Design an enzyme around this catalytic site. Structure first.
Site, mmCIF file in Angstrom:
data_model
loop_
_atom_site.group_PDB
_atom_site.id
_atom_site.type_symbol
_atom_site.label_atom_id
_atom_site.label_comp_id
_atom_site.label_asym_id
_atom_site.label_seq_id
_atom_site.Cartn_x
_atom_site.Cartn_y
_atom_site.Cartn_z
ATOM 1 N N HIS A 147 77.072 128.893 -18.451
ATOM 2 C CA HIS A 147 76.000 129.372 -17.544
ATOM 3 C C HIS A 147 76.587 129.947 -16.272
ATOM 4 O O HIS A 147 75.975 130.850 -15.686
ATOM 5 C CB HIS A 147 75.063 128.223 -17.192
ATOM 6 C CG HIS A 147 74.573 127.489 -18.386
ATOM 7 N ND1 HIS A 147 73.726 128.087 -19.310
ATOM 8 C CD2 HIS A 147 74.714 126.204 -18.729
ATOM 9 C CE1 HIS A 147 73.429 127.183 -20.235
ATOM 10 N NE2 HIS A 147 74.022 126.052 -19.923
ATOM 11 N N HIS A 170 79.809 126.687 -7.444
ATOM 12 C CA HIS A 170 79.635 127.759 -8.431
ATOM 13 C C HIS A 170 78.930 128.933 -7.787
ATOM 14 O O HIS A 170 78.477 128.832 -6.660
ATOM 15 C CB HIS A 170 78.890 127.276 -9.660
ATOM 16 C CG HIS A 170 77.526 126.820 -9.306
ATOM 17 N ND1 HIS A 170 77.249 125.533 -8.893
ATOM 18 C CD2 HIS A 170 76.352 127.466 -9.230
ATOM 19 C CE1 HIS A 170 75.967 125.410 -8.556
ATOM 20 N NE2 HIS A 170 75.362 126.632 -8.800
ATOM 21 N N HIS A 212 76.139 132.412 -8.668
ATOM 22 C CA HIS A 212 75.170 133.170 -9.484
ATOM 23 C C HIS A 212 75.368 134.633 -9.104
ATOM 24 O O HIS A 212 75.566 134.925 -7.927
ATOM 25 C CB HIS A 212 73.727 132.721 -9.204
ATOM 26 C CG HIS A 212 73.507 131.261 -9.391
ATOM 27 N ND1 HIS A 212 72.946 130.762 -10.543
ATOM 28 C CD2 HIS A 212 73.772 130.201 -8.589
ATOM 29 C CE1 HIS A 212 72.891 129.419 -10.434
ATOM 30 N NE2 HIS A 212 73.350 129.044 -9.220
ATOM 31 N N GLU A 257 69.965 134.331 -5.867
ATOM 32 C CA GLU A 257 68.785 133.532 -6.283
ATOM 33 C C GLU A 257 67.800 133.509 -5.129
ATOM 34 O O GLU A 257 66.689 134.008 -5.271
ATOM 35 C CB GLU A 257 69.234 132.148 -6.679
ATOM 36 C CG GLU A 257 70.164 132.198 -7.870
ATOM 37 C CD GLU A 257 70.112 130.993 -8.717
ATOM 38 O OE1 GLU A 257 70.457 129.906 -8.181
ATOM 39 O OE2 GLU A 257 69.815 131.070 -9.909
ATOM 40 N N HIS A 292 76.927 128.437 -4.321
ATOM 41 C CA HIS A 292 76.312 127.113 -4.190
ATOM 42 C C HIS A 292 77.400 126.058 -4.086
ATOM 43 O O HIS A 292 78.076 125.812 -5.084
ATOM 44 C CB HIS A 292 75.403 126.821 -5.382
ATOM 45 C CG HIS A 292 74.185 127.667 -5.368
ATOM 46 N ND1 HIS A 292 73.319 127.827 -6.451
ATOM 47 C CD2 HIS A 292 73.673 128.408 -4.359
ATOM 48 C CE1 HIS A 292 72.360 128.635 -6.096
ATOM 49 N NE2 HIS A 292 72.510 128.994 -4.824
ATOM 50 N N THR A 341 68.384 125.261 -9.579
ATOM 51 C CA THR A 341 67.853 126.572 -10.032
ATOM 52 C C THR A 341 68.108 126.783 -11.515
ATOM 53 O O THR A 341 67.723 127.854 -11.991
ATOM 54 C CB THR A 341 68.421 127.721 -9.192
ATOM 55 O OG1 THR A 341 69.809 127.792 -9.520
ATOM 56 C CG2 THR A 341 68.219 127.537 -7.710
ATOM 57 N N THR A 342 68.679 125.814 -12.181
ATOM 58 C CA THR A 342 68.841 125.855 -13.648
ATOM 59 C C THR A 342 68.217 124.588 -14.179
ATOM 60 O O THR A 342 68.131 123.570 -13.485
ATOM 61 C CB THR A 342 70.315 125.908 -14.094
ATOM 62 O OG1 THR A 342 70.920 124.624 -13.958
ATOM 63 C CG2 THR A 342 71.130 126.918 -13.318
HETATM 64 C C1 LIG Z 1 72.502 121.700 -13.097
HETATM 65 C C2 LIG Z 1 72.879 121.715 -11.647
HETATM 66 C C3 LIG Z 1 73.526 120.615 -11.070
HETATM 67 C C4 LIG Z 1 73.918 120.616 -9.744
HETATM 68 C C5 LIG Z 1 73.671 121.717 -8.964
HETATM 69 C C6 LIG Z 1 73.050 122.843 -9.513
HETATM 70 C C7 LIG Z 1 72.950 124.025 -8.594
HETATM 71 O O1 LIG Z 1 73.417 124.093 -7.481
HETATM 72 SE SE1 LIG Z 1 71.896 125.571 -9.293
HETATM 73 C C8 LIG Z 1 72.657 122.829 -10.848
HETATM 74 ZN ZN LIG Z 2 73.438 127.169 -8.391
#
Ligand SMILES: Cc1cccc(C(=O)[SeH])c1
Ligand SMILES: [Zn+2]
Ligand SMILES: Cc1cccc(C(=O)[SeH])c1
Length: 258
Positions: free
Chosen positions: A62, A92, A94, A104, A117, A196-197
């Site tokens: 992802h 990470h 996006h 986002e 993020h 956001t996921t």
């Molecule tokens: C699944 C998941 C876990 C921890 C942070 C996120 C985000 O920042 Se988008 C997403």
């Molecule tokens: Zn994110």
């Protein structure tokens, strides 16, 4: 038929497996800069990344995560809207297929090329898995990326991506200093929201910095060479891994600055 960013499994489908997708505090949102109110009671952010210990970089199908040792108070976020101490676990991005999309959050409906993020968990809940079950469990520091000059502190990330091209690949990624990803100013907007996921848990205090960082076209082009697929599967470029803006509902976005 797992969730993703395609026509058949993208954000408009997520609510069937994850009904909280239509919840009361979903992210991301558009930040209407004229409506956000200055909250003179917020504090300066405290971003303390001097002791950070990066371990690994992972393509999870992802995005890619740069993971940190969070078994001690090393790299922590405090202050601003936060009560207590939030420990950095991973970052990470996006990003888009084109420079005109990928973020986002939006700012007065403006989309940036990408969004970083930096994920932190509230240490009063003991572990990240417990923290995501709490309304104040996470603090995510969101930083916009625009295309212009290179970001020198991003290049070590860019240059390892060929080794984690496909889903499930990881690589050692020690001694990476996330301070080199921050803009000069820590002026921010803040609101209560979600991952956001999937699983879209409503556990996030969002802290979105106003000042974007600049990255080069060559840097973001290398993000766009990643794959959503596993090794030996049809190539599907990892692009447009962003969720669009969700209804603000009964929330206020607060500004740290006038
Ligand atoms: C699944 C998941 C876990 C921890 C942070 C996120 C985000 O920042 Se988008 C997403
Ligand atoms: Zn994110
Ligand atoms: C993900 C990936 C695959 C193949 C080449 C690159 C370069 O940085 Se060129 C990145």
């Amino acid at each position: 038929h797992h969730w993703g960013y395609g026509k058949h499994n993208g954000p408009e489908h997520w609510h069937k497996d994850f009904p909280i997708a239509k919840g009361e505090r979903q992210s991301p949102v558009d930040i209407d800069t004229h409506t956000a109110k200055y909250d003179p009671s917020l504090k300066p952010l405290s971003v303390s990344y001097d002791q950070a210990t990066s371990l690994r970089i992972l393509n999870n199908g992802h995005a890619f995560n740069v993971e940190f040792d969070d078994s001690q108070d090393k790299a922590v976020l405090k202050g601003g809207p936060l009560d207590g101490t939030y420990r950095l676990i991973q970052f990470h991005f996006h990003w888009g297929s084109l420079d005109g999309q990928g973020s986002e959050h939006t700012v007065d409906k403006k989309k940036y090329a990408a969004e970083l993020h930096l994920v932190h968990w509230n240490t009063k809940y003991g572990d990240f898995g417990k923290a995501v079950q709490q309304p104040d469990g996470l603090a995510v520091l969101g930083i916009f990326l625009k295309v212009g000059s290179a970001k020198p502190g991003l290049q070590k990330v860019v240059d390892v991506l060929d080794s984690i091209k496909t889903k499930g690949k990881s690589a050692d990624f020690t001694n990476f200093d996330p301070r080199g990803l921050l803009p000069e100013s820590l002026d921010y907007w803040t609101y209560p929201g979600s991952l956001t996921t999937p699983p879209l848990l409503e556990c996030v205090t969002w802290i979105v910095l106003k000042e974007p960082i600049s990255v080069s076209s060559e840097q973001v082009l290398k993000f766009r060479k990643l794959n959503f697929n596993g090794e030996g599967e049809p190539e599907e470029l990892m692009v447009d891994n962003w969720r669009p803006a969700q209804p603000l509902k009964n929330r206020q976005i607060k500004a740290s600055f006038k």
